[PDB]
Amino acid sequence: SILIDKNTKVICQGFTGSQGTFHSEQAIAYGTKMVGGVTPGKGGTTHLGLPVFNTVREAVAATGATASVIYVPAPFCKDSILEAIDAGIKLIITITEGIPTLDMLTVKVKLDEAGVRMIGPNTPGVITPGECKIGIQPGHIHKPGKVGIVSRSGTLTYEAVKQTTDYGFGQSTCVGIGGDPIPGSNFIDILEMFEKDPQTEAIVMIGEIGGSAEEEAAAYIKEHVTKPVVGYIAGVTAPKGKRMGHAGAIIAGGKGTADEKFAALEAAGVKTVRSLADIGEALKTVL
């Protein structure tokens, strides 16, 4: 598994808001070691049976949490993420959608310099089936297993989770890199982690239109990934220059089409599948 496991202690920023509450309840039911939350102005209270702190540093000092999940509205995310980086949090999972690209541009530079890992934003999150769940994914479709999944899409990830669970492969860890143009982590970052994770025997890489992370991942996989990889790119039928839901799902300057990504992955030796329904079949082939 990568990123998180049964030992990961997690705090939630935006803990007392609707989504933070609802999903922390889900994480808690899953057995995720949520140890606390942060909502400025509500420090010292308790919520979902856990301490709420005014700041992340208070939360970290009090609980020792190394991971924070963020359910803070977009306007305050940059502030939330920078706070978490400043408090020593080493793993940030930002669920939040709508964060201005320029904010993430800066946050990304910060994350890389501080050596802090961020998954997201605009991601369903991260889950190591059977051990730790951080995010909004449904945990009853997963099965502790051997397929590592990285995706720019939550729903497509679920399809792949359903398939790898149905074929019995199960998942080592599912990582949603999110649908934004500048994520905290990209395919290459997650790919390297799966390659180095003994529990992961195969990787499903799910991408979509826009940017060139997939093409770069392709080149990376060819030279540094030995484990079998099954790839799926959504958006073959997407028009160019139009946002398809995700802020990152837009083909800018005619570059980054789904076909170019499939092609790039095929050339790097990745097992691609034209139909998202065939991810499980493609894994059977390579396992």
Binding site: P100, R274, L276
Partner: protein, 388 residues
């Protein structure tokens, strides 16, 4: 969101960048009166639509008489301008920009986008102005010069000079160019733009730089902190359904096809469209239900998807979400009756009560097939539009 050329030029002017003297006009009378306010002609008259290629479509003319300004305004106001960048329905011309003619000595290109590969705002300049920057990049990449804004320092004059010198500019044009780089970089950062494109950035015969056109794209995720940009939105430039969808928390993009798609998830939406295409179908739209698949939202979704006459069937693909499958089924049923959905609907449900929701659909008696998985769902909607 996109801004009109005239709005881009007002912004440039606000940042002290230069643009021709001009007036945005909503009536032929305003357009003709702009002539003497501008001065001696000839005058450039331009349809204001978000799409580019207006020149090729006849939406930009250089005229030399008030009578012609008025004729051009009369010809375009309230009419739709189709360019290679709009769909066959074009975009409504509600403003004609009337500006002073400019003596063009040379056409340059200066633009900026957020480069995702380098994760920086990248400005690019080229001596190849007046041409689609993509064409120049494809064929003469060596003619495109770029600098990445450093998030730590903000744009720096040496970057403007770097581009200026690579463009072979010299003397006062270097300072003018640097100043424009600094202002546009500042606008990019301060207004949360996603895109700037000055094509052409002109060296006038009098030896000055001037923005002859301006294309600005704002980061929509930042409009909550761009009140001025917020007000500049011109919804007439977009398919009105997108805004309708959005106020209902749906993301809708119309396509050419005839199989409507209603999915929760951008990725799944695109994947569903692709799988429908893979199985011989033609997706009519992208519609990510995002929001809770409530009866109200699903109903809106249908109204929006169905407002397109070409839609012959609708494939609903719902995997997960905050609403149980059976409630979604009840909502699809309610939507179908209430919207008077008279087309066949194929539904693929995954999650809690998937099979019971399926039962509810099957037992409603409405023309709604509950599919058994993705591939099946695709094949069935494809088959459902066979002959229509």
């Amino acid at each position: 969101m996109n801004l009109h050329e005239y709005q881009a030029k007002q912004l440039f002017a606000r940042y002290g960048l230069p643009a021709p003297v001009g007036y945005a006009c909503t009536t032929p009378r305003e357009a003709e009166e702009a002539a003497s306010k501008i001065g001696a002609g000839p005058w450039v008259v331009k349809c204001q639509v978000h799409a580019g290629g207006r020149g090729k479509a006849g939406g930009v003319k250089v005229v030399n008489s008030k009578e012609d300004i008025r004729a051009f305004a009369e010809n375009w106001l309230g009419k739709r301008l189709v360019t290679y960048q709009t769909d066959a329905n074009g975009q409504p011309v509600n403003q004609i920009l009337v500006e002073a003619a400019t003596d063009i000595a040379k056409e340059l290109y200066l633009g900026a986008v957020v480069d995702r590969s380098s994760r920086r705002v990248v400005f690019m300049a080229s001596t190849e102005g007046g041409v689609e920057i993509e064409k120049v990049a494809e064929e003469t990449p060596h003619l495109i010069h770029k600098v990445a804004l450093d998030p730590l320092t903000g744009p720096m004059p040496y970057q403007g000079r770097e581009l200026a010198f690579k463009l072979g500019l010299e003397g006062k044009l270097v300072q003018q160019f640097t100043k424009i780089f600094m202002g546009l970089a500042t606008i990019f950062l301060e207004r949360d733009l996603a895109l700037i494109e000055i094509n052409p950035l002109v060296i006038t015969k009098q030896g000055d730089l001037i923005c002859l056109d301006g294309k600005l794209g704002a980061d929509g995720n930042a409009l909550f902190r761009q009140p001025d940009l917020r007000e500049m939105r011109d919804q007439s430039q977009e398919d009105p359904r997108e805004a309708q969808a959005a106020q209902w928390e749906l993301n809708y993009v119309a396509l050419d096809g005839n199989i409507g798609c209603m999915v929760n998830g951008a990725g799944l939406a695109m994947g569903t469209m692709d799988i429908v295409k893979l199985h011989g179908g033609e997706p009519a739209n992208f519609l990510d239900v995002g929001g809770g698949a409530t009866k109200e939202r699903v109903t809106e979704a249908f109204k929006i998807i169905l407002s397109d006459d070409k839609v012959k069937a609708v494939l609903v693909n719902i995997f997960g979400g905050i609403v149980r499958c059976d409630l979604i089924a009840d909502g699809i049923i309610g939507a179908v009756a209430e919207v008077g959905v008279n087309v066949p609907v194929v539904v693929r449900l995954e999650g809690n009560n998937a099979e019971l929701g399926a039962k509810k659909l099957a037992d409603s008696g409405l023309n709604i097939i509950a599919a058994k998985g993705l591939t099946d769902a695709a094949q069935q909607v494809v088959a459902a539009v066979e002959g229509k």
